[PDB]
Design a protein around this nucleic acid. Structure first.
Lengths: 123, 56, 71, 114, 209, 127
RNA sequence: GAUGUCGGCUCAUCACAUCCUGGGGCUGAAGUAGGUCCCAAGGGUAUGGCUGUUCGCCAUUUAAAGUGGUACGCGAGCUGGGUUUAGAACGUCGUGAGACAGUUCGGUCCCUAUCUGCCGUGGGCGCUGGAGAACUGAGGGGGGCUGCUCCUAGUACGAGAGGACCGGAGUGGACGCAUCACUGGUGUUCGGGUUGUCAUGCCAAUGGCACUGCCCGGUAGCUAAAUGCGGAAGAGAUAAGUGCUGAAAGCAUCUAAGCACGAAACUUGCCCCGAGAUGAGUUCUCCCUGACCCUUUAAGGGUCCUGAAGGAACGUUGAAGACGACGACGUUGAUAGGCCGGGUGUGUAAGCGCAGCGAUGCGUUGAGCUAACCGGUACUAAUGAACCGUGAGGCUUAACCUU
RNA sequence: AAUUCCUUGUCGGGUAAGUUCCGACCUGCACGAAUGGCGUAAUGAUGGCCAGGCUGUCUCCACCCGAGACUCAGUGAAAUU
RNA sequence: CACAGGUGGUCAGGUAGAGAAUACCAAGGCGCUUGAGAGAACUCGGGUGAAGGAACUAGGCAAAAUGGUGCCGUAACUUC
RNA sequence: AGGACCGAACCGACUAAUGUUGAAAAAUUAGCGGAUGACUUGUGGCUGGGGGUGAAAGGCCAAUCAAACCGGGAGAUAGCU
RNA sequence: CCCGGCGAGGGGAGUGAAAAAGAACCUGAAACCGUGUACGUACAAGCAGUGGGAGCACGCUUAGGCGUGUGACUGCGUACC
C-alpha cells in the first residue's frame, strides 16, 4: 500500500477475510501508492468456491484507504479500513461480481461500470 | 580533533579581530535638562523629551 | 587544443573550443599563450599585466603614440 | 493590500443554511458520468463544524448500515444539487466517534427545539 | 518580454462548472508606473524600468527621489528592471496590468525566493536521519562522510551541505494561468509562489520553447 | 525562521509559563508599577489588557465570567470596582512601556510598565 | 615510535573500456525481428525476506535493473551483528594443559578541527571626488535522463502473414525545485471536553496541579504522504556516416584545396551565481564651489572657519535570518502591543428564567470567548542631537577649451 | 538436533520470502545410553520463528517545547604541542 | 567535591486508589545558585503523529498498547 | 504450611533508551526478577598473595584482580633499544 | 593626600645611601602576555632562510655616497636530533 507487506480486506466473493498487497503497480522506485492507484495482491486466504486459491498472485485497484481517497473536488471519502477489488491480471475490469461494504465516488469511469452499478453504495 | 604544531601568537590576535567591541559614535544630552542621557532610553527622572515619567 | 579545466563538478574532463577563445574575448588566445613562458608565480604576474590585446582593430592607446612592429 | 483574508469571506455563499455540529442534514449530488445526468443523496450526521469561505464542506458521516464511512461534500461545488437542513442539533463536543461502528438509529440526533 | 511585479495574497481551492476543482494561488495585479523607459540611445542597454507600488517616503534619499520625480511621481516602493525584444519601447503612460495574460497561457514565475531560515544540514537536502538505536555516540542525526580518501585527497564542489537559502530567484517554470479577472484584479495561477504570504514576486510570460 | 508569528517564549516550558504569568499579572495588581525585561513586559502588557477591556464597565455577572477565564482573587477584586472607572476613557493602551534601559547585573534590555494615567507613584528606586 | 577489517545504515565522487535513448554504417537485413555497430561522461540506473553475509536462493516492479577505482570508498561518521575459545559449554581431538576455520547464548568501541577543503555569511580595503538606484557578461555551474500510446502509417516494402522511422501531441516514471489552499502532520501564544485531589468561606458556577495531567477539534507559519512542475523549439562547430568534384593506379573514393547534410556530447538557447573583469565597467538619480602658516611637495603636516549628499550606532520591529547582513520603520510614524470592524477557530459563555429525581439539558442567545492574518486607530513608546563622511577632487601623450 | 567434513544437505511448512526456525528423510560428521539417553508438567528477566491489539524502530520524515550550542553578560579547561 | 552514588534502628495524618504502588496533600522539608534573551545546526531531555505493522535491525527494543474492581465467557496439555 | 506467585519498602540488574574529554571512576530513566526465604541484614571477630575465600568465572581479597601493598637482596640481569 | 565597602590594589607626598632596597623587600635572565615607537603588510603565494633590492626614520655620515634598524619586492632554494 504505503508500506511493504500490508494485509487488507477482501472486496469480492473471490476470497475470505484478508488478502496481501505484495507490490504497487504504475511505476517503480515506489514504496507508496497515490490516490488513483493499482495494487498487486496475493490471495492470503481464499474460499473453496471462490474464483482463486491460496497464494495465486493477481492485479487489483483501491476501493477504501483508512486515510481516505479523493480526486474530483479533492474531498475525501474516509473509511474504517483499507480494502481492495481484484482486477483481471492482464485483461482489466473486476473479476468479482459483488462489492462488499461501501465504495468511493473517485471510481466513476467507463472501465469501472462493473463495480459502480452494484447496490451497496454510490448508485 | 587535535593539531599538527603549536599555533602563533599573531594568529590569536587575528582570530579575535572581528569579535571586538565597537564604537558608540558619541552621545546624547537632554532637550530639557542639564542631566546627561542614555541614547533612546529614559533616565530615572524621565528626561528624554521633558515631561515626567517613571519616578522610581 | 581544447583549453582543459576541471573547476570542481561532474565526471569528465571539461573543455572549451579553440573557436570560442578567438570568437569571444579575443585577447585570451594570446594571453594564455605567453603566460606559460614566464617565471613561477609573482614575477610572471607582473610580466603578464603589461600586455593588452583588447577586442581587435579598436585599441585605445592612441595618445601614447605606439611604435608599429612587423614580426 | 486589503485583499488578504477578505477574499475568503468575499467568495463565501450567502444563501447556505445556518449550522452547528450535530445538525444531521442531507447532501443531494449528481453521479456525473459520461453523458447522462442522474441524482443521489447521502444522509447521516455531520460530526464536525465547517465555515471555510469558499472551501466549506459538509463532512457527513453516514452510519445508517454496514461499516462506517465518512463523506466530505464541498458545499461550494456546482454539482452539489440541494441541501435540506432537517434536524439541527447540539453536542458540546468536537467529535462523535462512539457511533462509528453502530450505524443503527445512530445518525438521527435531535432538533434543539423550544 | 518583461514581468508584472505581483503580490502573494491569496490561496484557493476553486470550482469550475464541470464538477472539477483546481488548487490555485491568487495574485493582485498592480499597474506598472515607468521611470525613464531606458533605450539603446544610451550605451547598449535596452530595458524598461517599472514600479508597482507606493511608499510614504519621509526617509528616502534624494538619489531615490529624483528617480521617482522623473517617474509617474508617486513616491515609489522601489526599482525593478526587465530586458525586452522586438524594437525600442513605447515611452508614456503604459500601465501594464491584467491585459498581459489574455494570450499568455502559461507563466514562468520568478520569485524573490523562499525564506526558510537556516535550511542547512538534512532539511535542505532531504537526507535520512541517523538510527534511533545502538547507543550511537552523540548521534541521532548526521549527514554522512562528504568525500572519500587520499585518492582525490580533497572535497569536491557542489556536494550537498549546509548553508542558508540566500534568497536568490527560483523559477518554478511553466505553470498555467487558470483565469484572469479584470475589475476584481485577480490573476489566478495554477501553481505556487515562493516565500510566505505577503511576499513580493515577479509573474512573467513563460520563457520556454 | 519564525515567519507570520507573534508573542514570546521567555524562560521555560508551558506548565512553568502559565504559573509564572499567574505570579506576574498578580504582581501587577499588587505593585501597580513594575520594571522587567522588554520581552517580559510585552507578555505582561498582552496578559492584562484583555482582562481590563471586559472589566471596563461594571457588571457582577461579567465579574463571575472574568473569574472563569482568570481564576485569581487578587485580579477579580481589583477589576470592575477599582480598575473599571479608571480605564473607561480608553480603547486600548490601558498601559504603556517606558524603555528604562539595560540590566545592571548583566546587560539584558529592559522596559518599565506603567498604567496609562499613572501620576501617583511610589518614590523608591527599582532594578 | 601504527595505512585498522567483514557485515549492516549514512553520505558519495572520479575513468568510460556505456545498462539505455539519441545520429549512422554492415547483414548470409526486404520491412518487422534478430545478428553486427561506430560516435558519445551528458543523464536516469528499484524493493522485502532469510543469514553476522560480500556472494546465494526466493517473491516482485520498470523500457531498464550498468562496467572500473577509491587505506580492496567511508569508527579525527555510525554499531560490535561477526571474529566471540576474557567466559562457559555441546560436538570433536589428546594421558592432559589446551585447541578447534564444526557450533550455539548475550556481550564495554575514543577525539570540542591548527592549517587545509566544502557550503553559507559578515568585517576590512579598492574601483581614482564622493554618494544612492537600476544594470551588462569576462567567467563558471543547473537542466541534459527515459517509457507510453495517438497522429505520422496497414503505406513504401514482402510470396503472405506482417509491415518501416523521423517529426508533432498529451502524459507517466526516475531525478529536482518550489508551495500550504486541498488532503494529512504539528501548531506548549485559539475554543471545547474529562478523570482525580487540592482550592475559590459555603451553594450555583470555577480554576491551580497530575509530561502541554489526559484528550478532541485548530489559524497563520513551517512540512510530505499532498500540491504545482522542468527536462525546449532554434542555432552553430561537428562526430560516426551518405556524398559530391578529385589523385597515387586515365577509375574510385569524407580530403589535400573545396562545399551540401549530419547526436542528448562540445559553443550555446532555457535556468542560476557573477565587475577584484588590477584592460576594477556603464547608464540614471543626488551633493559638496570658504581661508592661511610651513616643508620633503602629482604630496603631506598644523590651523581657523567648517563637513553636504550619504552612513552607521541607537529605537519599536519584519511577510528576512545563528551572528549579522537584507527589509518595514522612529510622532512627518499603521512599526509593535493594545483596541475596533472583518478574516479564519470553537459550538451556543457567565448571569437569569424553566423542565427534570438530581446530575444536566433547554428558552433567554443562535451565545460568549479568540493566536500569529487584513484594513483602521497616534491609544501607547521610539527627544533635540552628537559622530564617520567636507568646501569640486593626480601626473603625462594625443583630441577640445583664445590653449 | 546445541552435534553435520560437504553445506545455506533434500523436501514439506509459515512465508510476498526463509542461510535460521519447525516437521519429515538419510543420501547418517567422528550421533549413542551417568562428560548419560528417550520423554515431560510447572519454571527461566533463556534462545529461534509468526499474526494480531498496539507502536516513529523504520518506510519518509514534519512540526512544537526546554536545558546546553547559539545571543547578551561572567568566569575559563583538555587530548595535543 | 554542596557528587543525580552508598548506608542500620523506631514512628505512622487526609481524599481517591488491591496496598506503605500511585495523583494530589495535613505536619514538615525545601528552591539541589550560572543568569536573561533567542527558540540556528546539532546534542540531550520532553510532547505528538496520516497510512502501514516490524516492512527497522543482529534482534518486536524506553518505543507503544496492556494493568484495577465487577460481571459473562474460557483451549490443548498438566505432577490438577 | 509453601526454597509458590504480582508487588512496593528493602536487595539485585536479563533487556531497552541515554551517558562515552558524563551531572557521576555504571550513574540516570523505563521494562525486570527476589521481597517470609537456600532471603534481606546491623554489630562485633577472624583466615593474608600461587595464600586465603568461591552454589566455579582460573571469581574475590581497600570506587582495583588470570598473581595485593611496602621494606630489603639490588645499581637483578642488558647478546637490546 | 587621591580613588574605595568600612575592602583589594597602585599612585602622589614624605623617609633612606639606595625603595631603578617598599615589605612575597637580596641583584635578576629566559619562556609568557601586553604597551610605546619606527619601518612594513590590500598583483596578495611553500621550512620563512639565502643571494639581489626601491624606500623611510634616526645619525650635523667634516654630506663625500656612509652608520644604525627595518623593508615593498623578487632570482634561488625542502628543518635539526
Amino acid at each position: 500500500m504505503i508500506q511493504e507487506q500490508t494485509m487488507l480486506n477482501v472486496a469480492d466473493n473471490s476470497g475470505a477475510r484478508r488478502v496481501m498487497c505484495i507490490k504497487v503497480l504504475g511505476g517503480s522506485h515506489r514504496r507508496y501508492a497515490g490516490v488513483g492507484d493499482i495494487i498487486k495482491i496475493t490471495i492470503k486466504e481464499a474460499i473453496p468456491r471462490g474464483k482463486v486459491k491460496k497464494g495465486d498472485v493477481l492485479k487489483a485497484v483501491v476501493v477504501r484507504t483508512k486515510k481516505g481517497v479523493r480526486r474530483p473536488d479533492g474531498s475525501v471519502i474516509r473509511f474504517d479500513g483499507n480494502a481492495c477489488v481484484l482486477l483481471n491480471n492482464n485483461s482489466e475490469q473486476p473479476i468479482g461480481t459483488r462489492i462488499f461494504g461501501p465504495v468511493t465516488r473517485e471510481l466513476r469511469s467507463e472501465k469501472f461500470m462493473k463495480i459502480i452499478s452494484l447496490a451497496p453504495e454510490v448508485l | 580533533a587535535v593539531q599538527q604544531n603549536k599555533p602563533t601568537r599573531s594568529k590569536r590576535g587575528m582570530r579575535r579581530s572581528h569579535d571586538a567591541l565597537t564604537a558608540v559614535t558619541s552621545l546624547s544630552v537632554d532637550k530639557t535638562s542639564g542631566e546627561k542621557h542614555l541614547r533612546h532610553h529614559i533616565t530615572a527622572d524621565g528626561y528624554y523629551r521633558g515631561r515626567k515619567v517613571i519616578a522610581k | 587544443k581544447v583549453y582543459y579545466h576541471h573547476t570542481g563538478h561532474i565526471g569528465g574532463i571539461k573543455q572549451a573550443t579553440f573557436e570560442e577563445m578567438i570568437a569571444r574575448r579575443p585577447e585570451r588566445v594570446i594571453e594564455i599563450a605567453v603566460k606559460g613562458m614566464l617565471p613561477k608565480g609573482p614575477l610572471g604576474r607582473a610580466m603578464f599585466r603589461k600586455l593588452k590585446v583588447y577586442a581587435g582593430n579598436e585599441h585605445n592607446h592612441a595618445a601614447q603614440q605606439p611604435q608599429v612592429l612587423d614580426i | 493590500s486589503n485583499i488578504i483574508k477578505q477574499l475568503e469571506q468575499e467568495q463565501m455563499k450567502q444563501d447556505v443554511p445556518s449550522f452547528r455540529p450535530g445538525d444531521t442534514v442531507e447532501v443531494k449530488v449528481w453521479v456525473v458520468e459520461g453523458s447522462k445526468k442522474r441524482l443521489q443523496a447521502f444522509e447521516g450526521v455531520v460530526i464536525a463544524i465547517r465555515n471555510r469561505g469558499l472551501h466549506s464542506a459538509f463532512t457527513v458521516r453516514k452510519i445508517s448500515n454496514g461499516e462506517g464511512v465518512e463523506r466530505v461534500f464541498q458545499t461550494h461545488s456546482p454539482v452539489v444539487d440541494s441541501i435540506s437542513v432537517k434536524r439541527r442539533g447540539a453536542v458540546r463536543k468536537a467529535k462523535l466517534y462512539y457511533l462509528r461502528e453502530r450505524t443503527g438509529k445512530a445518525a438521527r440526533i435531535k432538533e434543539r427545539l423550544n | 518580454m518583461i514581468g508584472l511585479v505581483g503580490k502573494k495574497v491569496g490561496m484557493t481551492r476553486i470550482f469550475t462548472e464541470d464538477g472539477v476543482s483546481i488548487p490555485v494561488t491568487v495574485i493582485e495585479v498592480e499597474a506598472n508606473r515607468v521611470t525613464q523607459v531606458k533605450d539603446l540611445a544610451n550605451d547598449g542597454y535596452r530595458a524598461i524600468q517599472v514600479t508597482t507600488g507606493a511608499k510614504k517616503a519621509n526617509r528616502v534619499t534624494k538619489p531615490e527621489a529624483g528617480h521617482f520625480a522623473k517617474a509617474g511621481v508617486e513616491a515609489g516602493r522601489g526599482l525593478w528592471e526587465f530586458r525586452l525584444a522586438e524594437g525600442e519601447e513605447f515611452t508614456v503612460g503604459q500601465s501594464i496590468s491584467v491585459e498581459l495574460f489574455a494570450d499568455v497561457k502559461k507563466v514562468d514565475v520568478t520569485g524573490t525566493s523562499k525564506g526558510k531560515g537556516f535550511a542547512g544540514t538534512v532539511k535542505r537536502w532531504n537526507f535520512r536521519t541517523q538510527d534511533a538505536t545502538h547507543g550511537n555516540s552523540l548521534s541521532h542525526r548526521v549527514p554522512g562522510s562528504i568525500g572519500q580518501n587520499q585518492t582525490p585527497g580533497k572535497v569536491f564542489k557542489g556536494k550537498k551541505m549546509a548553508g542558508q537559502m540566500g534568497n536568490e530567484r527560483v523559477t518554478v517554470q511553466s505553470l498555467d494561468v487558470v483565469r484572469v479577472d479584470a475589475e476584481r484584479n485577480l490573476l489566478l495561477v495554477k501553481g505556487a509562489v515562493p516565500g510566505a504570504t505577503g511576499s513580493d514576486l515577479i509573474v512573467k510570460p513563460a520563457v520556454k520553447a | 525562521m519564525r515567519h507570520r508569528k507573534s508573542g514570546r517564549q521567555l524562560n521555560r516550558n508551558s506548565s512553568h509559563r502559565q504559573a509564572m504569568f499567574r505570579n506576574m499579572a498578580g504582581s501587577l495588581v499588587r505593585h501597580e508599577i513594575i520594571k522587567t525585561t522588554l520581552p517580559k513586559a510585552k507578555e505582561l502588557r498582552r496578559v492584562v489588557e484583555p482582562l481590563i477591556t471586559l472589566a471596563k464597565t461594571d457588571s457582577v455577572a461579567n465579574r463571575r465570567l472574568a473569574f472563569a477565564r482568570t481564576r485569581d482573587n487578587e485580579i477579580v477584586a481589583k477589576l470592575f470596582n477599582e480598575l473599571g472607572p479608571r480605564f473607561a476613557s480608553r480603547a486600548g493602551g490601558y498601559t504603556r512601556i517606558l524603555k528604562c534601559g539595560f540590566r545592571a547585573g548583566d546587560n539584558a534590555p529592559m522596559a518599565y510598565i506603567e498604567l496609562v494615567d499613572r501620576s501617583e507613584k511610589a518614590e523608591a528606586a527599582a532594578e
